[PDB]
Every structure is written in structure tokens, then in C-alpha cells.
Design a protein around this motif. Sequence first.
Motif, PDB file in Angstrom:
ATOM      1  N   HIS A 164      14.991  12.225  -3.679  1.00 15.46           N
ATOM      2  CA  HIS A 164      13.671  12.845  -3.627  1.00 15.46           C
ATOM      3  C   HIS A 164      12.654  11.914  -2.989  1.00 15.46           C
ATOM      4  O   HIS A 164      11.810  12.355  -2.201  1.00 15.46           O
ATOM      5  N   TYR A 165      12.744  10.619  -3.283  1.00 20.32           N
ATOM      6  CA  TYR A 165      11.870   9.659  -2.620  1.00 20.32           C
ATOM      7  C   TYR A 165      12.127   9.642  -1.119  1.00 20.32           C
ATOM      8  O   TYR A 165      11.185   9.657  -0.315  1.00 20.32           O
ATOM      9  N   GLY A 166      13.399   9.634  -0.723  1.00 22.38           N
ATOM     10  CA  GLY A 166      13.716   9.693   0.691  1.00 22.38           C
ATOM     11  C   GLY A 166      13.208  10.959   1.352  1.00 22.38           C
ATOM     12  O   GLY A 166      12.712  10.923   2.480  1.00 22.38           O
ATOM     13  N   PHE A 167      13.342  12.097   0.667  1.00 16.31           N
ATOM     14  CA  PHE A 167      12.818  13.352   1.199  1.00 16.31           C
ATOM     15  C   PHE A 167      11.329  13.224   1.503  1.00 16.31           C
ATOM     16  O   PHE A 167      10.858  13.637   2.571  1.00 16.31           O
ATOM     17  N   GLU A 177      12.726   4.379   7.145  1.00 10.63           N
ATOM     18  CA  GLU A 177      12.645   4.016   5.738  1.00 10.63           C
ATOM     19  C   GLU A 177      13.353   5.033   4.849  1.00 10.63           C
ATOM     20  O   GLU A 177      13.852   4.671   3.777  1.00 10.63           O
ATOM     21  N   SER A 178      13.414   6.301   5.273  1.00 12.30           N
ATOM     22  CA  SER A 178      13.981   7.338   4.416  1.00 12.30           C
ATOM     23  C   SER A 178      15.503   7.271   4.366  1.00 12.30           C
ATOM     24  O   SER A 178      16.109   7.709   3.381  1.00 12.30           O
ATOM     25  N   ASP A 204      19.216  14.486  10.229  1.00 14.86           N
ATOM     26  CA  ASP A 204      18.138  14.587  11.202  1.00 14.86           C
ATOM     27  C   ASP A 204      17.433  13.249  11.382  1.00 14.86           C
ATOM     28  O   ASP A 204      17.138  12.847  12.513  1.00 14.86           O
ATOM     29  N   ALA A 205      17.149  12.552  10.276  1.00 16.32           N
ATOM     30  CA  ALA A 205      16.578  11.211  10.361  1.00 16.32           C
ATOM     31  C   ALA A 205      17.458  10.302  11.209  1.00 16.32           C
ATOM     32  O   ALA A 205      16.970   9.561  12.071  1.00 16.32           O
ATOM     33  N   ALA A 214      25.196  10.452  12.247  1.00 13.59           N
ATOM     34  CA  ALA A 214      24.528  11.642  11.727  1.00 13.59           C
ATOM     35  C   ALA A 214      25.504  12.795  11.514  1.00 13.59           C
ATOM     36  O   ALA A 214      25.473  13.472  10.481  1.00 13.59           O
ATOM     37  N   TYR A 215      26.367  13.052  12.493  1.00  8.69           N
ATOM     38  CA  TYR A 215      27.257  14.202  12.383  1.00  8.69           C
ATOM     39  C   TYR A 215      28.346  14.005  11.338  1.00  8.69           C
ATOM     40  O   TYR A 215      28.976  14.989  10.938  1.00  8.69           O
ATOM     41  N   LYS A 216      28.561  12.779  10.860  1.00  7.63           N
ATOM     42  CA  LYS A 216      29.434  12.604   9.705  1.00  7.63           C
ATOM     43  C   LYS A 216      28.807  13.214   8.457  1.00  7.63           C
ATOM     44  O   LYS A 216      29.519  13.754   7.604  1.00  7.63           O
TER      45      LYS A 216
END
Lengths: 429, 18
Positions: A164-167, A177-178, A204-205, A214-216
Motif C-alpha cells: 500500500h505504501y508503494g501504491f 522509490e515505489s 508499470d513502474a 517488468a514482464y516477469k
Amino acid sequence: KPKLLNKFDKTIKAELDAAEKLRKRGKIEEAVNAFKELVRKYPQSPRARYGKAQCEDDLAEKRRSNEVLRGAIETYQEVASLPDVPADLLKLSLKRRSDRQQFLGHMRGSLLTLQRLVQLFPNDTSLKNDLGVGYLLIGDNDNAKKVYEEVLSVTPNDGFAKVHYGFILKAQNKIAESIPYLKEGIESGDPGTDDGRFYFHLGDAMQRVGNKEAYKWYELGHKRGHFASVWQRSLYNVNGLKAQPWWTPKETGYTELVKSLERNWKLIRDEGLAVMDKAKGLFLPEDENLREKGDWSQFTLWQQGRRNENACKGAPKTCTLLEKFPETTGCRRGQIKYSIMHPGTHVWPHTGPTNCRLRMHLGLVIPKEGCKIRCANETKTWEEGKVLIFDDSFEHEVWQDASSFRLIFIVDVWHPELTPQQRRSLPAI
Amino acid sequence: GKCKDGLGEYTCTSLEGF
Ligand SMILES: C[C@](O)(CC(=O)C(=O)O)C(=O)O
Ligand SMILES: [Mn+2]
């Protein structure tokens, strides 16, 4: 495990169990009256009061009634006001109160209830996590962020607080940072972290910072049932709908709408240009953090199936034309809007929220070189007076490297395989 | 806060009970 009976309630346990057996047998109406008589005779019993609330809760489910649920919400509160309430029962009652307040959309009410829970149980980390969600659901990301910061200062490896913090960090455009919070949180496997929103934003990040892993995460989000495919990553879906990045008019069935757009394209263009020239403030900058760089604005005529009356005063003939097509004016999961994009613009790879719409683009002013759109593994260009159709629940990306502005008209339609029932019932997006 | 072109909000649909 849960001790719900105080000293007095133990002495009437036989009457309390007799009433609860009625509820678990499914005789909701008899159970309500049983607990109502117990509340009458023992107005101070917390277990009787909670039994009444649960029966009202169950009854609201049987009758699908918001009004009956509002009664239950009040009775769960009454439980908490009685004397000598055991701690397990107090927590159960207010937790359900908050959850049912959220189900009804009483996000302000849920928040007050969650704030009381945290005051009453200041060492329960899960309740603080639930308080943060309360803030997220009302759009108060600043207070949500403070809650998860407090949780992580005490329990740094709480995975729910990490994701949730990363979101929140990602929503604030703190992309690099996320990533460790979203990844570490998902990897924790804690309850609440196996959620498509977190795989979606982690991938996406990673795409934005050029991390080829990312695609993993998309691949694993697919294997865990969150994404229909690695390329189609929308999260508000009706399963079974034909999934193709690019569509022809005939494939959609909306051939009359396409013909009307293509035959009347110049009037649509001219009203858009008039707004650009005399009412440019009606074009609003894109505000979903989808640009790497550049300038991109939209002038919206319909959203969530509702006509914007003042906006239509700026494109009255276009609005009159479109009124004949409820497949778009009634698409409560889409919009109808002009979109202007200027040179030097790159729109990040992104996905729309739902597979329940298809997106039509009508070219209005298209420079001869420099503008293109990719959907999935195929890239295309616009043509003045011509319609392109794609499913924006597939990953897509846009570039504008011309030497002048590019104007298109965007018309969302219901996915053609959705039934009239579904089109009437789906919640708006 | 609405999800128009992307998926940036915590929730994209409204909560209106039954
Ligand atoms: C960025 C865009 O609006 C296209 C797009 O992403 C979409 O229609 O979903 C444009 O090229 O104007
Ligand atoms: Mn898009």
C-alpha cells in the motif's frame, strides 16, 4: 477462540445459543425476533445486541436492502456503547460496522469507525492497515501515507503496508522509490498483497525506469488470475469477451456509427478547432500521470454515459450528431472527447481500467509524419476522416514527433458482446 | 478521482450499497 461473553452473558448462555442456532439454521426472521426479545429483557447484554445486529446484517443480505443494513450498522454501534463489552466482541462489532459502512459508500462514516478502532486497540497493526485503506477509499492519500509510514516504523516487514505504501508512492510519481515496496510486499505473501493492482503498478513502474523484469511480474500476475493475459491487464472485467488489440468496423457491428463519423468528420473537426481558437480552456491537461513528456489535453463531451451540457455548448452539432448512437452516449465505462497532442510528446505504455469498452479514434488534424500509436505488438497511424478501433485494455503507447498539433476525436463504445442487461447493470467507470 | 484512460486510483467504481 474469541471470548464474546462477559460475566452476565455467561449466565444466559442457554438463551443466547438458542437464538444463535436459529440464525445459523437460516431462520433469519425467527432469529431477529429471538434476539429482539433478549435485547428487550437484557438491554445491557453485549452478546444479545451483537446477535440482533448480525441477524439484521443477514436479513439485509436476504432482502438486498440498504435500509435494513443501516439498521444493522447502528446496532453494531450500540454493542460498543454497552458496559463491560469483551475486547474480542468489541473489535468484531466495530470491524463489521466499518466494513458495512464502506459497502454502502459511507466512507466518511467508516473512517470515524476505523479511527475509534485504532484508539481502542493501539497495538493492533491490522487495524491501522485498515485505517489506511479507509483513507485511500476517500481519496486522502496524504493521510493514508502517514498511516503506512507509522506501521512500517513499528513493523518494517509488514507486507500489506509495503504494497500500500508503494501504491501511494507510485501514484505520486515516485516511481523508482515505489518498486522495492511493491515487490517486497507482494513477495511477502501476507494477506492482502496478492492483488492485481500491485502487480499492475509494479510492472508499470519497472517499465518506466527501463527494468526488463517488468514482464516477469505481468507473467506472474497472469498465472495468479489477475490479468486475462500479459498484454491485456485491465482489472474491471467481464470474463469471456473477445480479446483483440485491433478491431475493424464490421467486427464491432457499429458500422452506422463509423459511417456517420467518417461522413461528417469535417463538422467534428471544425467545432474542435473553434474551441481551440476561442475557448481553449475547455481542453483540460491529461491528469493521470500517463506522459513521460509533452503536452496533451482533452475536451470531454460525455463521461460515464452523462452528457456535459456546458461542454456540448462548445460542440453543439457534434453533440447533436452523436445523440443518435446510444452505444456510445450510454457507455458508462467510456467517454466521448477531443484529444489534442503536440510535438515532443511521449505517452507511457499503459492500460485502461476495463475490458468492457472499445475505443474509436477519428482523425481530424493529422500531420503527415511523426504521430503513431502502438497497441500490443502492432503500431498504426491515423488518417484524417478515418476511424481506427482498438481495445485499450491492451497495453498501448503513443508518440507525437511532428512539427504541428495533432487532433483526434475519441468515441468509446460498449464491447459488442455485452448484453443489454450487462450494459444496464455494470457499475460506471 | 476517476479512472478515465488509466488505472491509477485505488478503486475505479463507486460504492453505493445494494
Ligand atoms: C493518448 C491518446 O489519447 C490515445 C489513448 O491513449 C487512448 O485513446 O486510450 C491520444 O493519442 O490522444
Ligand atoms: Mn490510452
